[PDB]
């Protein structure tokens, strides 16, 4: 089906504590495959997935050279923004940037992204047309004008529609074992009395990939949206994900409740019932 490649950059100023921190990570779908950390000893882009380790030194040296240029650029940006917002030299601030591409189930370019945040708020974003910018405030409108005058969107468009998707397709094929797979959730229910007249039923989805999943509880086929505790989908640490959904049920009424699990790795959506 559909796939994505995304890169995430975080730059954090550390006044009087030396150079800003810079962390870059890259993902294909929900699988991280590279990292760079300004504070690490290697000062190189590093593999974080087995399939990318097969790329040669030209790849690693190239990604290293380019990610260092990204780092330097963000070091500059932190100073620029401080100026734009008339902020003290003393405070720590954060620049984030994300960019990448989606391809559809045909593996052709579908969508491109390129956006920045400053101190956790949208700053500037390339619009879906890959030709125009959304500037979040007055400061960002300065950047927007500058990038319009330098024709940055055109250069980004060419990467997002071209080279980005070419990389993505290469990685999908090279890491086919890791990337073109689904791991179906292993499911189970637990039951725990909360009192003499109540029990929590918890529906578990474990060891699944990709992260996208829907866990829902029904009582007599009616969705219990407002009464379900749903935890954020969380990484197992091995490349798979976990999630649970619970309802507190009147003891004796277990048989009324069904948990429904939808996941790409499933032949059919699953229905679990206690008993």
């Amino acid at each position: 089906g559909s796939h994505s490649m995304r890169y995430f950059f975080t730059s954090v100023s550390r006044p009087g504590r030396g150079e800003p921190r810079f962390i870059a990570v890259g993902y294909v779908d929900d699988t991280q495959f590279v990292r760079f950390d300004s504070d690490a000893a290697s000062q190189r882009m590093e593999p974080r997935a087995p399939w990318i380790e097969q790329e040669g030194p030209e790849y690693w040296d190239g990604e290293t050279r380019k990610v260092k240029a990204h780092s330097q650029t963000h070091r500059v940006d932190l100073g620029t923004l401080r100026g734009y917002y008339n902020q003290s030299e003393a405070g720590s601030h954060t620049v984030q940037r994300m960019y990448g591409c989606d391809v559809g189930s045909d593996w052709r370019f579908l969508r491109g992204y390129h956006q920045y945040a400053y101190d956790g708020k949208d700053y500037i974003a390339l619009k879906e047309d890959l030709r125009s910018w959304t500037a979040a405030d007055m400061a960002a409108q300065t950047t927007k004008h500058k990038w319009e005058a330098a024709h940055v969107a055109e250069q980004l468009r060419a990467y997002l529609e071209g080279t980005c998707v070419e990389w993505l397709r290469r990685y999908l094929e090279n890491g086919k074992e890791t990337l073109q797979r689904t791991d179906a959730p292993k499911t189970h229910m637990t039951h725990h009395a909360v009192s003499d007249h109540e029990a929590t039923l918890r529906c578990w989805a474990l060891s699944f990939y990709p992260a996208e999943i829907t866990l829902t509880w029904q009582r007599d086929g009616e969705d219990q949206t407002q009464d379900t505790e749903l935890v954020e989908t969380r990484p197992a640490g091995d490349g798979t994900f976990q999630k649970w959904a619970a309802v507190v049920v009147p003891s004796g009424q277990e048989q009324r409740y069904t948990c429904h699990v939808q996941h790409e790795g499933l032949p059919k959506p699953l229905t679990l019932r206690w008993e």
């Binding site: 870059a24 790849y59 380019k66 240029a69 330097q72 650029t73 940006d77 950047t143 990467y159 990389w167």
Partner: peptide
């Protein structure tokens, strides 16, 4: 692979 050109805000 990442962008091969950079630009400042």
């Amino acid at each position: 692979g990442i962008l091969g050109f950079v630009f400042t805000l």
